[PDB]
A paper describes a structure:
EfpA is an essential transporter in Mtb and categorized as a member of the QacA (quaternary ammonium compound A) transporter family. Mtb EfpA is a 55.58 kDa protein with 14 transmembrane domains (TM). EfpA TM helices organize in a typical MFS transporter fold where two bundles formed by 6 helices (TM1‐TM6 and TM9‐TM14) are arranged with an internal twofold pseudo symmetry.
Mutations identified to confer resistance to BRD-9327 in M. marinum include A339T, G328C, G328D and F346L3 (numbering as homologous residue in Mtb). These residues are each part of the BRD-9327 binding pocket. Mutations in A339T, G328C and G328D appear to directly interfere with BRD-9327 binding, likely accounting for resistance to the inhibitor. Our MD simulations demonstrate that the phenyl ring of F346TM10 partially forms π–π interactions with the benzyl bromide of BRD-9327; a leucine substitution (F346L) which confers resistance would abrogate this interaction. The side chain of Q332TM9 above the compound is displaced upward in the presence of BRD-9327 resulting in shift of 2.6 Å from the apo state. The head group of PG1 below the molecule and lower in the vestibule is displaced downward away from the compound.
Numbering used by the authors:
A (entry chain B), B (entry chain A): 49 to 518
Write the structure that this text describes.
């Protein structure tokens, strides 16, 4: 009971953040019908959460040291649960933006502390391997349940979908309080100036990136904000040289195996993000599956991923992360190749969707556990805070960068085959066939990126003694 | 009985040529101890066959159009059979060279005609697909038989190893005489100047490439012969402009999927040749399996390849050559990755050699049939000669080019890990471990080359109607 409550409590914010993220995507069309926030306002509800999630994440890593990791986990999760209630009673556009900003602040504080808790509470060995498998398991369970919950009761209203995080948020706070021990260490002074410039640089960079498409990549407010991001980043690096208790220990990423590992998760997160988005839009637009049936159809992904994670936890103590990452990616590579050739519209479910999803899930499950263990391998307790934050930050940062290239390929080929860059709701059934072949073509580009990820996975070079022993 | 005698007869030269090559490899050390031809002559027995095999191949493609494809097949195989008897009674170094030259001339005349017989004897449809599988099947049966026969009765004498080709050589002539019909077409005049310059250019290019390492890449006989190859090649291209009945129809390779397909088999053949040479030296030097037990240990490869060829022959009428080539290569990719991580000296047979060999065999067998069908797809009868000759030539030309890069990587890492560039018979068991890990490393570079082959295979764009229908 003590072990089971511990792993469930630690992985709670992974369940909440991913489940809330998918519910937001499902409920975004109906927010437009009610609030009438226009097409400009459609992205602010998504970018508001992302803006402060990425802005405050590096602050949230070191915050667990100077206040405590367990208290930081409850405080961060509690703010998220409260923010979801305010989000579900939004009056207008302004209230919904402030509510989404508050959720990201709560999730920015708690997400790094969740992975840092994995590193600290469970001693290296089978306990950390099992905890890592469960931590990555609830990441996938949340997203599917978001589709099912979002797709199930979105008909009655979109407000009820957001209130569903309150029962889950409260039970995780109850489990965390009654199953985690506040290890009383000496509190460490926070880097005031170092954290201010990091938060300023990250928020400004995200603002410029998000606001570019809306207003223009050279208008002046985009590059103007990017100039402030560059200025803060340079001043942050200069100040961190002589900084005590740094927000980012740059000296730490000189091991020649931390850089390789942290470069791998950066692009591996980009491949995973572009894969979920592309498959999500393809299932929604081409197949027309709807959220409820799409969510119920992805249950085999969760069961398949659970098998891959469970197997890999046992295998990580005998095989190095190098082979397991390549072995898992190899399975995913076949699943995406199969889905790149036999994925026309109207194909049945069992032979064409159950198999590649199940095979791909085991590949993702197998490769996630070794990467997570090697990310948090051999750091300490005074430097595990920021290192966990950077692993989350690089995972999320690689999403838009790779996906931007992929979406350009979808758009380029959709015009080449004959198609329109408008909404799917107006298509000629031949422009819609062009879009069908554009998505299937871009899946090869995602496969090309996955090859590069495996290319630098060959430089990881961690033995299983460092990551999953003692 | 007519179909079985036909397919066995047509692919007989592939059995002879491949089997003879492996027997010469196995028997080379014992030829040295008797004839005492020194290290300089060690390669002249191998390069003499290759020098004239590549030199006369392009002339042998057009030779069936002016004399007859059935007559050319019997004459070529008969000269190979007669040359093997002379090769087995060699008195000294000079006569062994002349005997190997005569074998290559017979193989150069028969090999292009053998693949031309596949295209012309069997109508497009299930007959050609089954004949292609058998044609490729007996290439691998021949290689493994060369190990088993070479390694079995090498003990008594190496001369008996070369006489084993006479019972097989005679029966393939008998089958070809009583199972192939001489389709009486009008004989087409031969290109005199074009064939002469093509033979001169190819022989000089091979002579310069072969004699380079022995004498040096800049001595004057290397670039001097290379100068003759370039002068002949340029003159050959000039006279082929106004050539009636050309030896190489350059205009034919402008379809944008003939170039892609023929570039695939060039580098696909280079990948395959480096894979057998690297695995052959690894098994010989590191594992110390000896020829007889190595040959018996590769019997699962023949059975595994037979399953792959048999499955692919039925699947090629429903799936395009694009997906089958990628599907076959994907299986080979996993086998080579598995062998690149869990292949140390001293590992057992069943878990570490039977599985990667069987999986790799099915992968190669699956990919071989679609490539062969698309290579000979949509040509005719008056241009099938040179097209098949070019396909055999590019397959054989890609071997040394890719293998030169792979061997350079093997050597470089052997020194990096701490090793010696001498023979394996003097090793310190720590320099042999460095060589062991060098071969395992170079298997990754072969896997990188296979990926590039897969990328080019996506541009084939043949439907199954063009290659395996009607
Ligand atoms: C230079 C700038 C750095 C590049 C990224 C900028 C922000 C992306 C904005 C796009 C908004 C929506 C998409 C999105 O972003 O999604 C990925 C992820 C969570 O997914 P979402 O919650 O959006 O849900 C998924 C739905 O599917 C969406 O369709 O968001 C992020 O956190 C973005 C990563 C950046 C945060 C961390 C670092 C920021 C600062 C850069 C470091 C150095 C700067 C200093 C100089
Ligand atoms: C991977 C990082 C490793 C380092 C990780 C180390 C760094 C520290 C963090 C550790 C914890 C994170 C791991 C969590 C598990 C991995 C995430 C995941 O897997 O989560 C499920 C996902 C939705 O949840 P998420 O919100 O997490 O999504 C991803 C995030 O957004 C961005 O990472 O859903 C899917 O799997 C999509 C389906 C997969 C398809 C399989 C292939 C079939 C292709 C056929 C084509 C058919 C259609 C045609 C189409 C054209
Ligand atoms: C101490 C350490 C070191 C010190 C420090 C030393 C210095 C650090 C080195 C950094 C990286 C250098 C190169 C990185 C680029 C990637 C390599 C690459 O580009 O080459 C990939 C290679 C060949 O192919 P290419 O054709 O590209 O090469 C030829 C030309 O590029 C084409 O012209 O392929 C492979 O063998 C990879 C095998 C695995 C792939 C199959 C499975 C998928 C992988 C995992 C996915 C995980 C998903 C996770 C989701 C959960
Ligand atoms: C520029 C020159 C072109 C590049 C290749 C040159 C010849 C390789 C000599 C090396 C001798 C031994 C290895 C070898 O070659 O092996 C591959 C194959 C059959 O294998 P082997 O029988 O050797 O047995 C395998 C044992 O394992 C060996 O260890 O040989 C060949 O045919 C070589 C290909 C070239 C022939 C066709 C075209 C030649 C002319 C080039 C075209 C344009 C020129 C005009 C300008
Ligand atoms: C492929 C061309 C397609 C276009 C073809 C179209 C063009 C026209 C011609 C068509 C007919 C040719 C096809 C014949 C079949 C393919 C050849 C083949 O397959 O023949 C068996 C081969 C020996 O016969 P060959 O003499 O023909 O050899 C090749 C030639 O020399 C050059 O092509 O043996 C082997 O398979 C080696 C073992 C394979 C290993 C599998 C992966 C395991 C890796 C684990 C590593 C463990 C050790 C570590 C190591 C470090
Ligand atoms: C029209 C008119 C135009 C003319 C026609 C075009 C011709 C060829 C150009 C492209 C050829 C190379 C393509 C790209 C490449 O080179 O890359 C492969 C690709 C990307 O990955 P990379 O990481 O390399 O890209 C990194 C960056 O290039 C550098 O950073 O991967 C894939 O999708 C391939 C999927 C299949 C591979 C798995 C199965 C094995 C394949 C079959 C082997 C058969 C064995 C032989 C047995 C017979
Ligand atoms: C008609 C069909 C057969 C055409 C498809 C063949 C090519 C047009 C495509 C198929 C896959 C593509 C490759 C897939 C992956 C990549 C990796 C890509 O790099 C990235 O994804 C980098 C992402 C980043 O910027 O962070 C560069 C192009 C490349 C080599 C692509 C080059 C073009 C390729 C070979
Ligand atoms: C010892 C540890 C640190 C592992 C490090 C190995 C990697 C640095 C190797 C393994 C796979 C290699 C790649 C495999 C194949 C290729 C294709 C190669 O070009 C070819 O087409 C090779 C075949 C040829 O034409 O000769 C260019 C380098 C590259 C990307 C290689 C670059 C170096 C890589 C990444
Ligand atoms: O995120 C997952 N899907 C999606 C991601 C998206 C997206 C849509 C989806 C959908 O699925 C979907 C939604 C409504 C109706 C039909 C399908 O539209 C914007 C970009 O992001 C996902 C969750 C769990 C498991 C696998 C996945 Br692919
Ligand atoms: O040609 C095949 N092997 C070889 C190729 C070689 C080579 C050696 C071998 C051997 O095997 C071998 C020979 C003697 C003792 C032990 C092993 O030395 C020079 C370079 O070429 C082969 C044949 C059929 C199936 C698979 C293969 Br890999």
């Amino acid at each position: 009971r003590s072990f089971i409550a511990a792993v469930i409590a630690i992985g709670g914010m992974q369940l909440l953040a991913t489940m809330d993220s998918t519910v937001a995507i499902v409920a975004l069309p109906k927010i437009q019908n009610e609030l009438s926030l226009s097409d400009a306002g459609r992205s602010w509800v998504i970018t508001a959460y992302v803006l402060t999630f990425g802005g405050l994440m590096l602050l949230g890593g070191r915050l667990g040291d100077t206040i405590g990791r367990k208290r930081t986990f409850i405080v961060g999760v509690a703010l998220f649960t409260i923010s979801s209630v305010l989000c579900a009673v939004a009056w207008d556009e302004a209230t919904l933006v402030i509510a989404r900003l508050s959720q990201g602040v709560g999730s920015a504080i708690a997400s790094p502390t969740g992975l840092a808790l994995v590193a600290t509470t469970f001693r290296k060995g089978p306990a950390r391997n099992a905890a890592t498998a469960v931590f990555a398991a609830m990441t996938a369970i949340g997203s599917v349940m978001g589709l099912v919950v979002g797709g199930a009761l979105t008909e009655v209203s979109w407000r009820w979908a957001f209130l569903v995080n309150v029962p889950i948020g409260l039970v995780m706070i109850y489990l965390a309080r009654t199953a985690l021990r506040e290890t009383n260490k000496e509190r460490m002074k926070l880097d005031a100036t170092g954290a201010i410039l990091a938060t300023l640089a990250c928020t400004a960079a995200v603002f410029a990136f998000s606001i570019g498409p809306e207003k223009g990549w050279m208008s002046g407010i985009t590059i103007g904000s990017g100039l402030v991001a560059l200025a803060a980043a340079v001043a942050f690096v200069i100040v961190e040289r002589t900084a005590e208790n740094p927000v980012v220990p740059f000296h730490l990423f000189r091991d020649r195996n931390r850089l390789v590992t942290f470069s791998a998760i950066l692009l591996a997160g980009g491949v995973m993000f572009s894969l979920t988005v592309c498959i999500g839009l393809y299932v929604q637009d081409i197949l027309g599956y709807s959220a409820l049936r799409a969510g119920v159809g992805f249950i085999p992904f969760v069961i398949a991923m659970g098998i891959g994670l469970g197997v890999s936890s046992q295998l990580v103590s005998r095989f190095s992360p190098r082979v397991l990452t390549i072995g898992g990616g190899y399975l995913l590579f076949g699943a995406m190749l199969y889905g790149s050739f036999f994925m026309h519209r109207g194909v049945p479910y069992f032979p064409n969707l159950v198999m590649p999803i199940v095979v791909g899930g085991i590949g993702i499950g197998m490769a996630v556990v070794p990467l997570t263990l090697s990310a948090i391998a051999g750091v300490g307790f005074d430097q595990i805070g920021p290192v966990s934050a950077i692993a989350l930050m690089l995972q999320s940062l690689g999403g838009p960068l790779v996906l931007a290239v992929i979406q350009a390929v979808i758009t380029s080929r959709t015009l080449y085959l004959g198609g329109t860059t408008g909404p799917v709701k107006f298509m000629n059934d031949v422009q819609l066939a062009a879009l069908d072949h554009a998505y299937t073509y871009g899946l090869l580009w995602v496969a090309g990126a996955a090859i590069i990820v495996g290319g630098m996975a060959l430089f990881i070079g961690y033995t299983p003694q460092q990551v999953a022993h003692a």
